[PDB]
Structures are given as structure tokens and as C-alpha cells.
Structure 1
Amino acid sequence: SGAIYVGNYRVVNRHLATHNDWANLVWEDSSRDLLVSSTTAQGCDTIARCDCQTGVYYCSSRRKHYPVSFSKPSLIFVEASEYYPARYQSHLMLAVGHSEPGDCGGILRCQHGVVGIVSTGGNGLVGFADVRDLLWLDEE
């Protein structure tokens, strides 16, 4: 589990969104595994606006932050899980690292701010849903 809290937005994995998230929906995209809902309180996270390919992510199943090198956001084939059939997920970045179902939501960050959240795992790989192209998170 985990979310990004920027401005009056909460960014979560679409497959982990709660009823309150769907009842206060701003935007969702199944192909990216992302959903954004509105919040009453302002958040403290800042979004990175860069092309970094190195950063650090939080792994809840290890209670640890790991430094990683990650690929550029791309369209990647992801195997079937309890939440999605086997399909292509867009705006996904891959790295070598540990990721279980429960690690989704952990933040990946670079020197500029939050880059994305854990969305996929297994086989010694971790995949992150990028948010750096969502410029509207910084306004309204």
C-alpha cells in the first residue's frame, strides 16, 4: 500500500483504490494502473520534473529503501495477477529489485522529487508507474 500526497491530490494504484477514492475521483487510467482522488488537507510530496534513470524506492516487504537504476517509461507486457489479466501496461519503468503484492504504492524518488509508485513485481524485477508527465498534479 501507499500513496503520493501532492497539493489536494492523492495518487494511488488504481487496483488498490478505496470507495472514498472512487467517490472523490479526479482521474483514473487502467492502462497505467493509476488513480487520483481529491483530499481535504494539502500534502507534502513534490513531483519530479526530469528524465532521471537513477533513484531510490521504498520496499515495504523489506522495510528498506533501495537505490536503483530504472528504464524510461514504456509499454511493457505484465503477467496476469489477481487485479489485471496479462496485458500491456503503459508508462511503466522497470528495475532490478524485490517487489511482492503488498509493495504496490511505495514511492520511487530522485534528487528532484517523486518519480512514481511501485505497480508490478516478481522474478527479481520491480516496476514503477511514472507520474512525471502528469503536470496538472502541480496546480489547482
Structure 2
Amino acid sequence: SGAIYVGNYRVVNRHLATHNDWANLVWEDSSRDLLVSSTTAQGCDTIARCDCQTGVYYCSSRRKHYPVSFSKPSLIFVEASEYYPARYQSHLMLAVGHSEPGDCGGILRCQHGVVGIVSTGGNGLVGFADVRDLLWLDE
């Protein structure tokens, strides 16, 4: 689990969105595994606007933050899971790092701010849904 709280937005994995998220929906995209809802309170996270390929992510299954090198946002084939059939997921970045299914939502960050959230993984890999291209999160 986990979310980004920037301005009056809450960014979560679409597969983990609650009823309140759907009832306060701003934007969702199944192909990216992302959903954004509106919040009453202002958040403290800032979004990175950069092309960093190194950063640090939070892994809840280890209660630890790890440094990682990650690929550029791309279209990658993701195996079938309890929440989606096998399909191509867009705007996904891959890295070598530990992950388990419930690690989804953990933040990946760089020197500039939040880069994205854990969305996929397995066998010593971890994938992150990028949010750096969503410029509207800043206003």
C-alpha cells in the first residue's frame, strides 16, 4: 500500500483505489495502473520534473529504503495477477530490487522529488509507475 500526497491530490495504484477514491475521482488509467483522487487537506510531497535514472524506493516487505538504478518509462509486458490479465503496462520503469505484491504504493524518489510508485515486480525485480510526465499534479 501507499500513496503520493501532492497539493490536493492523492495518487495511488489503480488496483488499490478505495470507494472514496472513485467517488472523488480526478483521473485514472488502467494501462498505467494509476488513479488520482481529490483531497480536503494539502499534501507535502513534491513531484520530480527530471530524467533521473537513479533514486531510492521504499520496500514495505523489508521496512527499508533501497537505492536503485531504473530504466526509462516504457511499454513492458506484465504477467497476469489477481488484479489484471497479462498485458502491456505503459510508463513503467524496471529496476533490480526486492518486491512482493503488497509493496505496491511505495515511493520512488530522486534528488528532485517523487518519481513514481511501486506497481510491478518479481524474482528480484521491482517496477515503478512513473508520474513525472503528469504536469497537472503541480497546479
**Normalising TM by the smaller chain, what interval?**
over 0.9
1:17 Cα deviation after fit: 0.1
Q: Secondary structure at the match of 2:102?
A: coil
Q: Which runs of 4+ in 1 moved over 4 A?
A: none
User: Equivalents in 2 of 1:121, 1:59: separation in Å?
Assistant: 12
Are positions 1:112 and 2:112 aligned together? Answer: yes
1:123 Cα deviation after fit: 1.2
Q: Which runs of 5+ in 1 are unaligned?
A: none
TM-score (norm 1): 0.99
User: Equivalents in 2 of 1:107, 1:45: separation in Å?
Assistant: 10
Deviations 1:55-88 (A, max 9, x none): 0000000000000000000000000010001000
User: Equivalents in 2 of 1:77, 1:109: separation in Å?
Assistant: 24
- Counterpart in the other structure of 1:68: 68
User: Equivalents in 1 of 2:50, 2:92: separation in Å?
Assistant: 16
1:125 Cα deviation after fit: 0.4
What is the number of equivalent residue pairs in this alignment?
Answer: 139
Identity %: 100
1:106 Cα deviation after fit: 0.1
Q: Secondary structure at the match of 1:31?
A: helix
Deviations 1:37-58 (A, max 9, x none): 0000000000000000000000
1:101 Cα deviation after fit: 1.2
User: Equivalents in 1 of 2:60, 2:115: separation in Å?
Assistant: 17
User: Equivalents in 1 of 2:47, 2:106: separation in Å?
Assistant: 14
1:120 Cα deviation after fit: 0.3
Aligned-residue Cα RMSD (Å) equals 0.4
Deviations 1:113-133 (A, max 9, x none): 000000001111000000000
Q: Which runs of 5+ in 2 are unaligned?
A: none
User: Equivalents in 1 of 2:125, 2:36: separation in Å?
Assistant: 25
